[PDB]
Amino acid sequence: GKLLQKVKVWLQEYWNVTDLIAILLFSVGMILRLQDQPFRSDGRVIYCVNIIYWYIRLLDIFGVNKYLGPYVMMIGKMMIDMMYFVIIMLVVLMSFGVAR
Amino acid sequence: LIPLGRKIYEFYNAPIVKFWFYTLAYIGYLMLFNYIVLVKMERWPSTQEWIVISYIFTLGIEKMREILMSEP
Numbered sequence: 001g002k003l004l005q006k007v008k009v010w011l012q013e014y015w016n017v018t019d020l021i022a023i024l025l026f027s028v029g030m031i032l033r034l035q036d037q038p039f040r041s042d043g044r045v046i047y048c049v050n051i052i053y054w055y056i057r058l059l060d061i062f063g064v065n066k067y068l069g070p071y072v073m074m075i076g077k078m079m080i081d082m083m084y085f086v087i088i089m090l091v092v093l094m095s096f097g098v099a100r
Numbered sequence: 101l102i103p104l105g106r107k108i109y110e111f112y113n114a115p116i117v118k119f120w121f122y123t124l125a126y127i128g129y130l131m132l133f134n135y136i137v138l139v140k141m142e143r144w145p146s147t148q149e150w151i152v153i154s155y156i157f158t159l160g161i162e163k164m165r166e167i168l169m170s171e172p
């Protein structure tokens with residue numbers, strides 16, 4: 001009943017909260033697009049960055065199928081292991097990079 | 101001043117505090133030694149380089165302390 005408790009229930013689903021961030025980002029992209037360039041050019045760019053999100057939301061739509069669905073939640077768990085790969089790679093990459 | 105001063109002393113002697121305060125000085129050292137090698141150096145060392153020169157020898161005295169103040 002409490003409005004803040006309704007909001008806290010909504011933030012629990014991660015695909016739902018990343019909807020509304022991309023909706024507000026597309027609104028910001030619209031208002032710039034409706035202005036004279038270069039404001040338009042940058043709101044073109046904001047439009048193309050929502051494309052990075054809205055194909056990835058097809059992963060959640062793909063979750064209904066009983067085979068691709070477990071495959072999608074498989075990907076999310078392996079990225080926690082991939083983060084530890086990213087940190088160890090980041091040391092070795094910048095050690096070669098600064099030295100070169 | 102006695103409850104507050106007991107808080108500062110017990111905090112800055114806790115081992116997790118003494119870790120992350122050597123760690124934010126190592127991650128502060130590594131940023132400085134990046135800047136001096138990427139940017140040019142002249143004949144005399146820069147202000148950034150002199151802090152790096154401090155960090156190496158003061159770590160050297162500490163590394164000798166670990167040898168001398170050991171168990172055998």
Ligand SMILES: CC(C)CCC[C@@H](C)[C@H]1CC[C@H]2[C@@H]3CC=C4C[C@@H](OC(=O)CCC(=O)O)CC[C@]4(C)[C@H]3CC[C@]12C
Nearest residue numbers: 082083084085086087088089090091092093094095097
């Ligand atoms: C260890 C791994 C997993 C991650 C570390 C790699 C990234 C953090 C790096 C690799 C390529 C980098 C990009 C390579 C080139 C550019 C273009 C650069 O833009 C310009 O130089 C302006 C245009 C120009 O001058 O040509 C801005 C930084 C950026 C996006 C870099 C941002 C940082 C990136 C993504």
Ligand SMILES: CC(C)CCC[C@@H](C)[C@H]1CC[C@H]2[C@@H]3CC=C4C[C@@H](OC(=O)CCC(=O)O)CC[C@]4(C)[C@H]3CC[C@]12C
Nearest residue numbers: 123124125126127128129130131132133135146147148
């Ligand atoms: C606690 C940890 C996580 C970070 C602590 C390190 C930073 C606070 C230091 C490390 C690298 C430093 C930078 C290294 C070199 C420079 C260039 C320096 O510019 C010059 O020496 C030439 C121009 C001038 O004299 O201002 C200005 C400070 C700055 C940005 C330093 C600002 C402070 C930095 C970011």
Ligand SMILES: CC(C)CCC[C@@H](C)[C@H]1CC[C@H]2[C@@H]3CC=C4C[C@@H](OC(=O)CCC(=O)O)CC[C@]4(C)[C@H]3CC[C@]12C
Nearest residue numbers: 124125126127128129130132147148149151152154155
């Ligand atoms: C002790 C280290 C390992 C961690 C703590 C980081 C800071 C205390 C250091 C790191 C970078 C330093 C800066 C690097 C370079 C400069 C430029 C320097 O500019 C001049 O001296 C201008 C005149 C001149 O060129 O002689 C003034 C000090 C300052 C800001 C330094 C102030 C102290 C900083 C922020």
Ligand SMILES: CCC1(c2ccccc2)C(=O)NCNC1=O
Nearest residue numbers: 119120122123125126159162163
């Ligand atoms: C040079 C790294 C370090 C250190 C820092 C954090 C954790 C472990 C070691 C140090 O800064 N001084 C004491 N001994 C060391 O080797």
